[PDB]
Amino acid sequence: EVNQHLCGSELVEALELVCGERGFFYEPK
Amino acid sequence: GIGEQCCTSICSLYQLENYCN
Numbered sequence: 001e002v003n004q005h006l007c008g009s010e011l012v013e014a015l016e017l018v019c020g021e022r023g024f025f026y027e028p029k
Numbered sequence: 030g031i032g033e034q035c036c037t038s039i040c041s042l043y044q045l046e047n048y049c050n
Contacts, residue, residue, distance in 0.1 A: 007036040014035065017042040019049030026048070028032035 006014050015024045031048055 004039055005036055006040060007033045009033070011031070011033050011035060011040075014040060014042055015031070015045050015048055018045045018047075022050040024045075024048045024050055026031065 004010075004013075011028070012026055015026055018024050031045075
């Protein structure tokens with residue numbers, strides 16, 4: 001089951017589409 | 030809500046756009 005989910009640490013990829021260049025406040029608690 | 034919470038699907042990327050810098 002290798003889908004584009006976001007479990008473990010693959011969410012940063014989803015947030016990459018958010019701003020990407022400018023970056024984001026990726027501070028997952 | 031920015032950790033891997035989104036695991037039951039892919040979470041609308043547009044929804045994560047608010048987290049941009």
